[PDB]
Amino acid sequence: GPHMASKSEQLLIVVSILEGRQFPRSPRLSLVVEARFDGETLSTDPVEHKEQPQFCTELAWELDRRTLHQHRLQRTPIKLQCYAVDSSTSARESVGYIVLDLRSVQEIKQAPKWHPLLSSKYTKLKPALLIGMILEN
């Protein structure tokens, strides 16, 4: 009819923020990673600003397969920013960003990979995040 409903499988996109490398050791600071996908922001809880920070957090969004297909075609990003948080002054500062896209994410799983932070505040070495991305069921 003139109005047509749509049905497709409900899915979870799960982004795993596993760990970092090549950060400066900063005992006064912590690190938070925030991810935004399609106007929905999720954040890790602060972890120590070690050289190899242990984020160990999954961030999950729900969508259906037809909406996912559209996001692939539009190359809708999952936008990550990494923040150094200074609890002594309740301040934070972006120390770099990563842009992920879903073009390849599938049930058929892919191994996590290292993504360097772009526009990094920490210009010695190459700070990076180990990130996994999967479609769950």
Residue numbers in the entry: -2 to 134
Could you share sentences copied from the article?
While the C2A domain of CEP120 interacts with tubulin and promotes microtubule formation (Lin et al., 2013, Sharma et al., 2018), our results suggest that the C2B domain does not directly contribute to this activity, as neither JS nor JATD mutations in C2B abolished the ability of CEP120 to cause centriole overextension when overexpressed in cells. Our structures revealed neither complexed Ca2+ nor potential Ca2+-coordinating top loop residues or cationic β-grooves.
